[PDB]
Amino acid sequence: MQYSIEKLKKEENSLAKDYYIYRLLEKNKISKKDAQDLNSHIFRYIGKIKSELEKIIPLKPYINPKYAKCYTYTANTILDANLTCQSVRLNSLVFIASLNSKDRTTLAQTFKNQRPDLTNLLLAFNTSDPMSYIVQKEDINGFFKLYNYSKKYDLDLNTSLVNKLPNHIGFKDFAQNIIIKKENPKFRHSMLEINPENVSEDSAFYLGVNALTYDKTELAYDFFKKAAQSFKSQSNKDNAIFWMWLIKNNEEDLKTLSQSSSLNIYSLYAKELTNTPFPKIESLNPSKKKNNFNMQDPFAWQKINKQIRDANASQLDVLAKEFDTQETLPIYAYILERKNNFKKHYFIMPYYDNIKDYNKTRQALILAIARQESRFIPTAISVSYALGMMQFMPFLANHIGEKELKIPNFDQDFMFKPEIAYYFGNYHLNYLESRLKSPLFVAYAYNGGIGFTNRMLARNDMFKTGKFEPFLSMELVPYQESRIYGKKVLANYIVYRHLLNDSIKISDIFENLIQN
């Protein structure tokens, strides 16, 4: 089922509409005339749809009309520009780097009183190490502009300076990136002297991980304790309390972790170590078979999803009743997760007939991936236009569909069919498992590609033997999305194996992650 550009313009803006516009663009079906008023019909003007539309209508914009004259100057003529223009152009460190040193000295004096931040950057670029100059002034704003300009700068930072960095909004991403990428070792070592009083939440957590890489277990405990006290989400608290336990072995930490309302790998592990029963998994079994909603219509999902997200307690009860059917089970569960304020545990098994002939271990992995990828919504579409319950990108879907399986009249929109999604998911999971074995490693590869997973596993500091392994390595996966994805899919997999009466102990999974 195609949609022409006319039909699409009559639909509301969404990721579904973006997807169908992108399909027209890749097939060269959008003329220069169709493309004129098209920016206002795109929900997320980023990535592939933007670069494709810009081959048709290339946009020169956007400079602010107030500062238009300021962008006519260059490095050779900046001293002819008025003071407002000079200051605007000095926002760019590349521009500052391009200036000659006589003109940097001149501008530095011009700006000493009213903007000493500019003065420090100007004079810093007259040296062979701008980072060293900015560090000596303890100019915190300048430090972050330099780091964003270039990641190669690396230098030891003293106690006074590192303790000022956390007050800047850049700090969290700065600390995480250098820690998980294992870059800027002098910055990393310096961050051992940040007082836990001065950090919180994610920044405290990563400063704890950093302390562990230098075997500073006492500093690590203090950071993780601060993370546990300050974290918003119960899931992140648990992650931090686990580390508190692993380092200092206090049984009250483990007990607290075993009694957590969040179902995650850390609370599940704590329950297993204390002989606490497996948590209660809700049971959704609607008597009503079907209703008038079309689960194969991606536009209807975008519409109903926005209703659900932007609704009061009263409207969620009406929606709950309407979608309490077998045909709409994934929507029901979606509504109930928001109706109960994320307190209860929903692990549905929809369109089960398509997977009941696989072994129960494979069933659980399929279900665990699907739960995380789409919450079982058949027409789910990601921002990169991954499609259906198992979130296949068009390239992979066409390779499997057209070349490998030779399906007649295959179109990528077949990924919206549960039968096809599960089938292809099984096929692709088969390929990943034969090479990787652990369901955790499969999950990393399913999300980030087998390329990066093999690169990570080929390193001699990842998933090898050690005091805190494999738990330390799970915190050092070099992409945030993949670190998180793996933890969640692993918990899902444990739960689904339990519901299917093929339980496995999570301690066995953790033992199999250590490469021998």
Numbering used by the authors: 18 to 533
Q: What does the study report here?
A:
We report here structure-function studies of soluble periplasmic LT of Campylobacter jejuni. The LT Cj0843 was identified from a virulent strain of C. jejuni and localized in the periplasm. The LT enzymes cleave the PG MurNAc-GlcNAc glycosidic bond similar to lysozyme with the noted difference that LTs have an additional (2nd) cyclization step; this step requires a boat conformation of MurNAc leading to a 1,6-anhydromuramyl product as the predominant terminal saccharide moiety. The crystal structure of the soluble LT Cj0843 from C. jejuni revealed an unusual doughnut-shaped structure containing four domains: NU-, U-, L-, and C-domains.
The most prominent feature of the electrostatic potential surface of Cj0843 is its predominantly positively charged inner ring surface. The outer ring surface of these ring-shaped proteins shows a more random distribution of positive, negative, and neutral residues. This ensemble of positive charges on the inside of the ring of Cj0843 explains why the majority of sulfate and acetate ions, that co-crystallized at 200mM concentration in both crystal forms, were observed along the inner ring of the doughnut-shaped Cj0843 protein.
